Design a protein around this ligand. Sequence first.
Ligand SMILES: O=C(O)CCc1nc2ccccc2[nH]1
Length: 167
Amino acid sequence: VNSFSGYLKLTDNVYIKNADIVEEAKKVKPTVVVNAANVYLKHGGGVAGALNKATNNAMQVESDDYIATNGPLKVGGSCVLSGHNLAKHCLHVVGPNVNKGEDIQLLKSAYENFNQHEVLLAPLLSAGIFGADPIHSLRVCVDTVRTNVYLAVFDKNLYDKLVSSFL
Ligand SMILES: O=C(O)CCc1nc2ccccc2[nH]1
């Protein structure tokens, strides 16, 4: 049993809810929250800007030190950093940004990072301002992630479309 409430079960391991990932993290304090990161860990907007704002910019301060030491992530890659006030850990995952021309095939590689964690609270990778089709992102998630993933979908309209079109 775990703390996640109000989710619709899509598969053995994938659950979905209409919710702002920030408010969900604040309530649940999951072991792992996933950030929709870029390779520079510049948390300006979208999910990343919202998570970072909720940490009072502590996520950005920690991320800048990580990049100064290690250099940029790979598209499809990840790093584990603090979850600050939102979670034990934040798994920063870089999905391909369609609005930058990145290979959508890298979306599967991005979701593979989730398999290193038994349970996660996450957004749909490469959705929102990253430009991918969220229906596609959900299909890749279900076909790639084998650990237990609780997906928070910000837009109520999109949530209803994801559920009603799910195969
Ligand atoms: O007002 C805020 O602090 C952020 C609101 C918000 N919540 C989000 C969740 C996901 C993506 C962008 C988001 N923007």
